């Protein structure tokens, strides 16, 4: 049959969407892109002809862009996450490129041909690429030294042919001059598709990846960096740090949460409880990589491209908070409050609606109009027959992807708490971390 | 030390990296950029010839960009920080150009030459710049005035010469139309390097700065805004609000922190503690400017470009949290938890590894493979012999800067706390503040 599915748990005001397929970035592959430069002398014939003034205008554009580039090289729960340097890998290769001949090694590997693999001084085997040959175009087609010195140019089609080639370089040095020598996502200027697919294919990766990457090439651009590196001899060199999708096609699910309160009629005197583990969950070698800020993940179809360094790694048993939030093994996380406030949280196949107090909560559709008015509490609505959900004054258009949703009838857990001794302010604490503060407040009841 | 250095404190599971050199943005200098406009009536000899069809397109393209601009003007711990208006100065200047003769005063100041200072009506002395002279191109050389305003064009090179001159205005109004009249960083279109280097050099700043700014021109771009301002008489004017680097070259350090836990074997029953005072620190006048989100800041070599308005200013005695977290003078900030979850925090010269529970923590090198397997608790690893570090499923590439790291041995402080009375939930509280809640609960543990 078809693909992705979802279920709502009435008991904990949450839903998970399963049936997705991972695409985790685990490692970084560095590759070196080079552009060959003419290092000309600005005394090419000092003439004033109609189109010689246009070429000389274009050399300027170029000669400045080389120096502009030279001057550039000068010497809930996401808080649990821990931090890294992102492009250390790339820069480290870029830093190795500054040793003595490492650059010429690349010049030489690449004069016979356009692609090459090369071993740097520290052994790392790195893919290199010559994508523009401005040295050859300028030195053997714009210094006409038979006819006649670049003082008097003949055709216009040679003015254009040039500002076409040079255009790429101007758009490159522009992107760097803005972004302090490091760009993401990687534009079509740093790497054209023809180049990026070629590069995908010559990488030290498996076919499982080479397919993933090539079909979702527009994502590969977003998870890559382009680090402007060095420009000495007649070479411009920037490093492109592509991602290594080391785990692929494992199951992924996406956990939705909204707050769950008592529905008492008093203006105050309501208790709230909200599952805090919102986010993505991929299976990753007998443990689950959990991606708490679930926006960073970009999905395409069912494929969930995440970046592992935005993850915790958790026991497989985290998955139990969805089925039995009270179970013994894992200790599911929540956050308490007295702030009974209405909202909806839209799921992959539906919507969750947290409707409280005097707030007005409906579910409308394109044709039948309003087709449900929610009663106070945490409820759910499939995207089958509903297009919008409105809570208060905010309209939510619901997601119109295809798939089966299952309503898991259950007693909301916020009912099991005695509100007189329920810890109203606890901003990331757990199930068990709350059950202790209750075992306590009952002991703190020492009578006469 | 002789350049850059780091020390890891085993006792507070944190590290500071010192030897960096400040460059703070303290103030804003406003400067006026103009482009001169011809304000034509749409009859270029409005006939149907080959190259006349192209010019009329570019005149059209231009006349729109001017109207388009016209229509634009119409009828942890970052939470302590405090908030301001960014472009109040630039906007306030912009508002002053709308007073009566202020524009003609600039116009008049700029027909003899392309730069001049001018005193606006309120005494503020402003640097001005005419960077494109389209009035002059169009009035002399595109409507030739002997024969006959150009009726049916001769050469093609005048079309190109034109859409070259004209690109700049288009690519400028493109940027503004998208970013609603305020862009940052200041692109190569708003101000070319040749210009931004000029403007630095003529600013009312010191040589200490003219040098800093001139070398790190790509960081000055990121710390400037560009405000589209006015378009009256035949003048286009935008204010480029460049930064003023008012403390420069003072020492900076960077405090890295990670969570520090008990390593008991039980699945729950561990206490954690984390230094929250993480982020950059430059000292600037007997006080330490503290930058809690370490990305307001950009680095270049040792130079740490920060923006003082993403800063607290704290007494010098703040550095004691690094030396002796319990001292009386200053009251170091922490955050408690029961959530012992494994992670790394990569530093400037090393890696911190917070490894707990059943989590698998190694440190590899590029060639020898794995060279350390961490035991549960908070440890550190120099970047000397280490290239990657893995915690759970997440791979970290470590920074490859050269510098000396010092591992400062100590009993981790979380070993000193009696966990049956330790506040597991405190989302930003202090050292002394926790020791309060304990000194108390330990008192309520009294007899009869």
């Amino acid at each position: 049959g078809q693909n992705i599915t979802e279920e709502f748990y009435q008991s904990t005001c949450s839903a998970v969407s399963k049936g997705y397929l991972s695409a985790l970035r685990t490692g970084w592959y560095t590759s070196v892109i080079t552009i060959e430069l003419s290092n000309i002398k600005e005394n090419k014939c000092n003439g004033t002809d109609a189109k010689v003034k246009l070429i000389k205008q274009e050399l300027d554009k170029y000669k400045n862009a080389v120096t502009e580039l030279q001057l550039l090289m000068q010497s809930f729960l996401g808080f649990l996450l821990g931090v890294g340097s992102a492009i250390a890998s790339g820069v480290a290769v870029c830093k190795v490129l500054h040793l003595e001949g490492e650059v010429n090694k690349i010049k030489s590997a690449l004069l016979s041909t356009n692609k090459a693999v090369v071993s740097l001084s520290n052994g790392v085997s790195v893919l290199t690429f010559k994508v523009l040959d401005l040295k050859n175009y300028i030195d053997k087609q714009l210094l006409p030294i038979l006819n006649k010195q670049s003082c008097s140019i003949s055709n216009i089609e040679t003015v254009i042919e040039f500002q076409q080639k040079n255009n790429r370089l101007l758009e490159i040095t522009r992107e760097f001059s803005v972004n302090a020598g490091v760009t993401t996502p990687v534009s079509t200027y740093m790497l054209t598709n023809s180049e990026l697919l070629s590069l995908i294919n010559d990488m030290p990766i498996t076919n499982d990846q080479k397919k993933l990457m090539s079909n979702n090439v527009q994502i590969v651009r977003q998870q890559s960096y382009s680090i402007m590196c060095i420009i000495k001899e007649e070479v411009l060199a920037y490093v492109v740090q592509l991602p290594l999708y080391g785990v692929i096609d494992t199951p992924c699910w996406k956990l939705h949460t909204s707050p769950l309160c008592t529905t008492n009629t008093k203006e105050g005197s309501n208790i709230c409880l909200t599952r805090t583990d919102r986010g993505w969950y991929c299976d990753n070698a007998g443990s689950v990589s959990f991606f708490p800020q679930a926006e960073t993940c970009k999905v395409q179809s069912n494929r969930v491209f995440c970046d592992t360094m935005n993850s915790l790694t958790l026991p497989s048993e985290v998955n139990l908070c969805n089925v039995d939030i009270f179970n013994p093994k894992y200790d599911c996380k929540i956050m308490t409050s007295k702030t009974d406030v209405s909202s909806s949280v839209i799921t992959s196949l539906g919507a969750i609606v947290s409707c409280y107090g005097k707030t007005k909560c409906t579910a409308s559709n394109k044709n039948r109009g309003i087709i449900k008015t929610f009663s106070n509490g945490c409820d759910y609505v499939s995207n089958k027959g509903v297009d919008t959900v409105s809570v208060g004054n905010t309209l939510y258009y619901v997601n119109k992807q295809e798939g089966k949703s299952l309503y898991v009838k259950g007693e909301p857990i916020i009912n099991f708490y005695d509100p007189l001794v329920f810890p109203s302010d606890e901003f990331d604490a757990s199930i068990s971390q709350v059950n202790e503060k209750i075992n306590q407040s009952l002991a703190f009841i020492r009578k006469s | 030390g002789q350049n850059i250095t780091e020390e890891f404190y085993q006792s507070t599971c944190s590290a500071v990296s010192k030897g960096y050199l400040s460059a703070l943005r303290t103030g804003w200098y406003t400067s006026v950029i103009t482009i001169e406009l011809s304000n034509i009536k749409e009859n270029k000899c409005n006939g149907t010839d080959a190259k006349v069809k192209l010019i009329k397109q570019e005149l059209d393209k231009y006349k729109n960009a001017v109207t388009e601009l016209q229509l634009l003007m119409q009828s942890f711990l970052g939470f302590l920080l405090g908030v301001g208006s960014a472009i109040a100065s630039g906007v306030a200047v912009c508002k002053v150009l709308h007073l009566e003769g202020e524009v003609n005063k600039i116009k008049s100041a700029l027909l003899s030459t392309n730069k001049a200072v001018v005193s606006l009506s309120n005494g503020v002395s402003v640097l001005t710049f005419k960077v494109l002279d389209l009035k002059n191109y169009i009035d002399k050389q595109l409507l030739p005035i002997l024969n006959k305003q150009s009726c049916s064009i001769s050469n093609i090179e005048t079309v190109i010469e034109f859409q070259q001159k004209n690109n700049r205005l288009l690519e400028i109004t493109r940027e503004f139309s998208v970013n609603a009249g305020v862009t940052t960083p200041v692109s190569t279109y708003m101000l070319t390097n040749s210009e931004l280097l000029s403007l630095i050099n003529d600013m009312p700043i010191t040589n200490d700065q003219k040098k800093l700014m001139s070398n790190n021109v790509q960081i000055v771009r990121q710390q400037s805004y560009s405000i589209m301002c006015i378009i009256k008489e035949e003048v286009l004017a935008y204010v480029v609000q460049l930064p003023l680097y008012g403390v420069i070259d003072t020492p900076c350090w960077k405090l890295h922190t990670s969570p520090l836990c008990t390593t008991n074997t039980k699945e729950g029953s561990n206490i954690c503690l984390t230094r929250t005072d993480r982020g950059w620190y430059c000292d600037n006048a007997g006080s330490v400017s503290f930058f809690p989100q370490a990305e307001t800041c950009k680095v270049q070599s040792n130079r740490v470009f920060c923006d003082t308005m993403n800063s607290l200013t704290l007494p010098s005695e703040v550095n004691l949290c690094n030396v002796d977290i319990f001292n009386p003078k200053y009251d170091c900030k922490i955050m408690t938890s029961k959530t012992d979850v494994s992670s790394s925090v990569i530093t400037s010269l090393g890696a911190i590894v917070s490894c707990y529970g059943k989590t698998k923590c190694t440190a590899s090198n590029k060639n020898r493979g794995i060279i350390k397997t961490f035991s549960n608790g908070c440890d550190y690893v120099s970047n000397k012999g280490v290239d990657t570090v893995s915690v759970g499923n997440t791979l970290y590439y470590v920074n490859k800067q050269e510098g000396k790291s010092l591992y400062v041995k100590g009993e981790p402080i979380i070993n000193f706390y009696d966990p049956l009375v330790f506040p597991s939930d405190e989302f930003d509280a202090s050292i002394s503040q926790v020791n309060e809640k304990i000194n108390q609960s330990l008192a309520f543990i009294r007899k009869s």
């Epitope: 290594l244 | 493979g369 791979l395």
Partner: single-chain antibody
Framework: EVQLVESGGGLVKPGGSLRLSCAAS????????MNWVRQAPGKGLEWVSS????????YYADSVKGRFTISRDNAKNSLYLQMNSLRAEDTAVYYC?????????????????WGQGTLVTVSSVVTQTPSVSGAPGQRVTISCTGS?????????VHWYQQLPGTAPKLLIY???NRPSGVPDRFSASKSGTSASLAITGLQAEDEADYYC??????????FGTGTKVTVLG
Amino acid sequence: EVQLVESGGGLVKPGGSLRLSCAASGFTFSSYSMNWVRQAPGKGLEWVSSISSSSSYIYYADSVKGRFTISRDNAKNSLYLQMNSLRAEDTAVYYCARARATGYNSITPYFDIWGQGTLVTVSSVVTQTPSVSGAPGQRVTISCTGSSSNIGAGYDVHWYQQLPGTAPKLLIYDNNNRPSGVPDRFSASKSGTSASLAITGLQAEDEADYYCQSYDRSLSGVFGTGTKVTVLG
């Protein structure tokens, strides 16, 4: 026990069929990519077919294209191989294997878990030094030499120890890292287009066939020709 146990092997007449099944147990199957790698009657180890974790990415060696069909039932914790139109070259021990990848500047699978294999008879490259011998206590080394593609194009190297009757066991992964049960005696290298295994102090248990493994961009995963290390006295 993390374990794989194959089944369905026997004898088959050419132009025939037979459907091998590997059942896995003691780990969550759905998370790893599963493989068939087979071994000829007397020597080499050659990769057959690979299947991704959720069955979206599946690939076959040229040897078996259009004839063999790989498949998996994650719900039944099992992996299948559907062989049709068999030939006399297909006779071999068919191993079932768990694949794994650990990425520093490359992602080249290795096999950390093997079954015992089921034998299937049908009737009616990267070179390494073919033999090494040395005395107990001594040091010996095995050279493993590859090409412009695979190792020289930036992939990694792995090593296996196959005692005479047994299944391959993982000996070295990612050039120089030892698994749980491998003594510090064993140590290995990578260089350019080639590798080297180094055994310090020969034992009774060290007498076995040694295969280096790596991944080639077209051949899609490749073993050495094998090295019989023999211990004297």
